[PDB]
Design a protein around this ligand. Structure first.
Ligand SMILES: *[C@@H]1O[C@H](CO)[C@@H](O[C@@H]2O[C@H](CO)[C@@H](O)[C@H](O)[C@H]2NC(C)=O)[C@H](O)[C@H]1NC(C)=O
Ligand SMILES: *[C@@H]1O[C@H](CO)[C@@H](O[C@@H]2O[C@H](CO)[C@@H](O)[C@H](O)[C@H]2NC(C)=O)[C@H](O)[C@H]1NC(C)=O
Ligand SMILES: *[C@@H]1O[C@H](CO)[C@@H](O[C@@H]2O[C@H](CO)[C@@H](O)[C@H](O)[C@H]2NC(C)=O)[C@H](O)[C@H]1NC(C)=O
Ligand SMILES: *[C@@H]1O[C@H](CO)[C@@H](O[C@@H]2O[C@H](CO)[C@@H](O)[C@H](O)[C@H]2NC(C)=O)[C@H](O)[C@H]1NC(C)=O
Ligand SMILES: CCCCCCCCCCCCCCCCCC(=O)O
Ligand SMILES: *[C@@H]1O[C@H](CO)[C@@H](O)[C@H](O)[C@H]1NC(C)=O
Ligand SMILES: *[C@@H]1O[C@H](CO)[C@@H](O)[C@H](O)[C@H]1NC(C)=O
Ligand SMILES: *[C@@H]1O[C@H](CO)[C@@H](O)[C@H](O)[C@H]1NC(C)=O
Ligand SMILES: *[C@@H]1O[C@H](CO)[C@@H](O)[C@H](O)[C@H]1NC(C)=O
Ligand SMILES: *[C@@H]1O[C@H](CO)[C@@H](O)[C@H](O)[C@H]1NC(C)=O
Ligand SMILES: *[C@@H]1O[C@H](CO)[C@@H](O)[C@H](O)[C@H]1NC(C)=O
Ligand SMILES: *[C@@H]1O[C@H](CO)[C@@H](O)[C@H](O)[C@H]1NC(C)=O
Lengths: 99, 198, 49, 175
């Protein structure tokens, strides 16, 4: 509706018998393939990310925001638990650091 | 086919020029409408040969290769439910000749100056655009509409959507099979509603 | 304007009336200065048609 | 009864008191020959749309003609035949050469055919390209996360007003 991409702001400009909008948008540019998981088992309990997504740089797992790669350590303050992990599909074992 | 009437019409004036201007504007507007609706993505995305979408079945909205026009199963029904006139824009003088004009309506419309122009986009090409959109929204989600497509597992995409409607992403994972079965049954119900008589 | 609206009352606003007319004052005629009279007699009053 | 058209044998059967025949409109679509007592079908001779494909004429004076309702693949109903003939679902295209390549639409001929001026320049007819092909490396255990962003500014032009007009109807009609 307001330009192509994630809209930040717009600036109106006047033209004869019309108007012109300058749609400022946020377009992600460089993407990297990653390995992901919907959750992780820590002590038989499934951990899901709150406002984030799990990714792996290889031998280690992190959690980051979807629209930008800002990897972070997985912690209880950064994830929420819901039940065991015999029902989820694609879950992977890992440690959840407790600050 | 009258010289006298034509030479009189030349005097009566040129209103037919503006009539044709209006009709041409209408036709160009129709082409623009089709482009605006379907041609929202220039990158044509192909569905991956592997179809592990977390149990979701999109084999009934995605194209079927074994047809002259690569079209889905729920588009063939729609096409067969709307009956265009002659489904063709070439009616030769020979076919209309021989007392078939008063019988066929198109021949009558065409002996009297009225013609139907063909659209700039074929049905197969529109289907290609739609298939690209489906592949993009399946493999990448809503990212392909903001720039370059970013692959994501379908289950996690649905989890993001659930978070969008104010439902925790755990609900989807803990009930993935049930949701997939519901979706597949609902997509079969559309076929029943369309392949039936209505 | 009142005649145009076919009413004796005009609500507040701005209305477009007839373009500015100027009525002509004179009435001229310009024919070639010819004094000879057409051959009516030779055409209508001639023997031997 | 004067007229203009093609005359052909007809399967229509006319009663003794019937001489002419008419169609949905008021138009003599049939007639009986007084000398031979045989029915004839009158068909208008003019039939088929004609469309002209031309560049600006400040760039080139050669054009291509699209004859709708003509199937050259079958004395075609054309004004002038040419060396380059291409058949399209819209109709026969004359004056343009088919190229197997696909570009963006410069001139929207019809179904999926667009013309252009290229290359000794000449007119070409090609199937329009929907866009670049692409494939998403989808997997159940793979995601793509942007590592950088681009700030893009785009312009959207929207008409807001139209010229206001007033007519003095007694100065246009009468003066
Ligand atoms: C991840 O951890 C789970 C346990 O939290 C593992 O599942 C157990 O594996 C042991 C050893 O094979 C079995 O004796 C248990 O019966 C399993 N329990 C359940 C609930 O599955 C699982 O194997 C681990 N994943 C990997 C890849 O090693
Ligand atoms: C994946 O990330 C881990 C970090 O979690 C990387 O291991 C670290 O590498 C840095 C750079 O040399 C070291 O300073 C750290 O000490 C390493 N971690 C630890 C715990 O010591 C790892 O190299 C990354 N792998 C890839 C393929 O990028
Ligand atoms: C998606 O649904 C279609 C139909 O709803 C499934 O197609 C069926 O496939 C089986 C063989 O596995 C056939 O016996 C049926 O006759 C098919 N039904 C059709 C074509 O209507 C398809 O298998 C489903 N996809 C998956 C992955 O199971
Ligand atoms: C929630 O709704 C689902 C269906 O929408 C229920 O699943 C059905 O359960 C009945 C038995 O109660 C089965 O016969 C059906 O086959 C199930 N349908 C599907 C699609 O799986 C479910 O039981 C309901 N309750 C809960 C707690 O989930
Ligand atoms: C003799 C050649 C004169 C030609 C002048 C140009 C024609 C102008 C019209 C003149 C028509 C005259 C016809 C007679 C007028 C009526 C007389 C009558 O009714 O008694
Ligand atoms: C991800 O990997 C596939 C092949 O596995 C490759 O074709 C694709 O370009 C990669 N994507 C990115 C963003 O590097
Ligand atoms: C993903 O698919 C592969 C096969 O391509 C399968 O081996 C694997 O178990 C699947 N993993 C998940 C989490 O679905
Ligand atoms: C011309 O008219 C006069 C009277 O107006 C008449 O006496 C004379 O005979 C006419 N000329 C001829 C040739 O008849
Ligand atoms: C004259 O017309 C009749 C039909 O009215 C026809 O049968 C006959 O053959 C015609 N004769 C000639 C010589 O044309
Ligand atoms: C259009 O015509 C003008 C006037 O003759 C000329 O200067 C200009 O070069 C022409 N443009 C093209 C593209 O030929
Ligand atoms: C044109 O006629 C040929 C046969 O001469 C036929 O095979 C082809 O389908 C026709 N094409 C169209 C567009 O009518
Ligand atoms: C173009 O395609 C036609 C068939 O449609 C073929 O006969 C011709 O050789 C092709 N030419 C090139 C240059 O590919």
């Amino acid at each position: 509706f307001c330009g192509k991409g994630y809209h930040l702001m717009s600036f109106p400009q006047s033209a004869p018998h019309g108007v012109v909008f300058l749609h400022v948008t946020y377009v992600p540019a460089q993407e990297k393939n990653f390995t992901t998981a919907p959750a992780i088992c820590h002590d038989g309990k499934a951990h899901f990310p709150r406002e984030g997504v799990f990714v792996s740089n290889g031998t280690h797992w992190f959690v980051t925001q979807r629209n930008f790669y800002e990897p972070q350590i997985i912690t209880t303050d950064n994830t929420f638990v819901s039940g065991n992990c015999d029902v989820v599909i694609g879950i992977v074992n890992n440690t959840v650091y407790d600050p | 086919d009258s010289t006298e009437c034509s030479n009189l019409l030349l005097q009566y004036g040129s209103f037919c020029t503006q009539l044709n201007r209006a009709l041409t504007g209408i036709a160009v507007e129709q082409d623009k409408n089709t482009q605006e609706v379907f041609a929202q993505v220039k990158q044509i995305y192909k569905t991956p040969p592997i179809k592990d979408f977390g149990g979701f079945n999109f084999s009934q909205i995605l194209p079927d290769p074994s047809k002259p026009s690569k079209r889905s199963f729920i588009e063939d029904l729609l096409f067969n439910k709307v009956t265009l006139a002659d489904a063709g824009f070439i009616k030769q003088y020979g076919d209309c000749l021989g007392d078939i004009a008063a019988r066929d309506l198109i021949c009558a419309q065409k002996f009297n100056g009225l013609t139907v122009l063909p659209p700039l986009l074929t049905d197969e090409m529109i289907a290609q655009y739609t298939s690209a959109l489906l592949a993009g929204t399946i493999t990448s989600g809503w990212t392909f509409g903001a720039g370059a497509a970013l692959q994501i597992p379908f289950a996690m995409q649905m989890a993001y959507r659930f978070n969008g409607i104010g439902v925790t992403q755990n609900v989807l994972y803990e009930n993935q099979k049930l949701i997939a079965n519901q979706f597949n049954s609902a997509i079969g119900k559309i076929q029943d509603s369309l392949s039936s008589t209505a | 304007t009142k005649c145009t609206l076919k009413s004796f009352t005009v609500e507040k606003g701005i209305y477009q009336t007839s373009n500015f007319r100027v009525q002509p004052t004179e009435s001229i005629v310009r024919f070639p200065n010819i004094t000879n009279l057409c051959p009516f007699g030779e055409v209508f009053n001639a023997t031997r048609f | 009864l004067t007229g203009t058209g093609v005359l052909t044998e007809s399967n229509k059967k006319f009663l003794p008191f019937q001489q002419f025949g008419r169609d949905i409109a008021d138009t003599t679509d049939a007639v009986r020959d007084p000398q031979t007592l045989e029915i004839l079908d009158i068909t208008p001779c003019s039939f088929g749309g004609v469309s002209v494909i031309t560049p600006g004429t400040n760039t080139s004076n050669e054009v291509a003609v699209l004859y709708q309702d003509v199937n050259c693949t079958e004395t075609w109903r054309v004004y002038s035949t040419g060396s380059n003939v291409f058949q399209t679902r819209a109709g026969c295209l004359i004056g343009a050469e088919h190229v197997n390549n696909s570009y963006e639409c410069d001139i929207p001929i019809g179904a999926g055919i667009c013309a252009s001026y290229q290359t000794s320049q000449s007119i070409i007819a090609y199937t329009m390209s929907l866009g670049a092909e692409n494939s998403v490396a989808y997997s159940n255990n793979s995601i793509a996360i942007p590592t950088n962003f681009t700030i893009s500014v785009t312009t959207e032009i929207l008409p807001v007003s139209m010229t206001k007009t007033s007519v003095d109807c007694t100065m246009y009609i009468c003066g």
